[PDB]
């Protein structure tokens with residue numbers, strides 16, 4: 308039922324954790340694309356659409372944290388997966404990342420971001436490895452720096468980061484359906500946000516995330532099923548005032 312799976316597939320169940328708010332066109336293409344892609348690669352999976360329905364700025368990392376907590380307690384691993392980044396090459400390892408976190412959307416392959424420590428887009432971890440990092444920071448509202456920070460959590464935890472090798476498709480490895488004019492990145496740094504972005508967050512993450520699920524809805528998109536989680540993220544306006552206005 309819950310898991311798309313056949314008896315012959317390897318046992319590891321992947322939760323696809325998709326940070327989401329107002330990307331409907333993209334969602335329509337993404338869900339069946341990922342059902343097809345994962346099924347051909349024989350990966351047991353379920354797709355969680357993590358829909359931010361509070362009115363705070365978009366918090367990718369906090370949503371991933373929520374999806375981690377709210378996914379089936381029998382998932383073995385997670386892929387934080389942008390909704391607009393579609394894998395076109397089946398050589399990409401979406402299998403269980405046993406030796407360490409696996410960064411699918413490598414800077415060698417990503418259309419826009421090419422620096423060594425970029426871990427955005429699509430990144431896979433075993434549940435144990437994600438907990439070892441205490442998940443992602445909750446302090447990043449708006450576009451930017453939540454991934455750079457998580458990189459530091461991975462490194463600090465002594466986890467080795469893996470990337471695809473021998474991929475030949477280069478910058479055509481993914482379809483990045485993202486018009487920068489229609490989908491404007493919320494990149495404004497509001498006051499003290501421009502400082503805290505690069506800080507060394509020592510306290511919080513997976514164990515301090517403040518939220519509640521408003522609704523949970525089964526959604527099927529052209530045959531391909533998923534679970535939409537309507538997520539209300541709390542904001543301590545004292546700690547992070549840059550959460551509001553947008």
Ligand SMILES: O=c1ccn([C@@H]2O[C@H](COP(=O)(O)OP(=O)(O)O)[C@@H](O)[C@H]2O)c(=O)[nH]1
Nearest residue numbers: 326327328329330365367389390391485492
């Ligand atoms: O308002 C937003 C902001 C981002 N996202 C999600 O977060 C991902 C990363 O955002 P974005 O695509 O803007 O980052 P970039 O293209 O720079 O990698 C998107 O693909 C979406 O899955 C979203 O759903 N709504």
Ligand SMILES: [Mn+2]
Nearest residue numbers: 389391483485
């Ligand atoms: Mn994008």
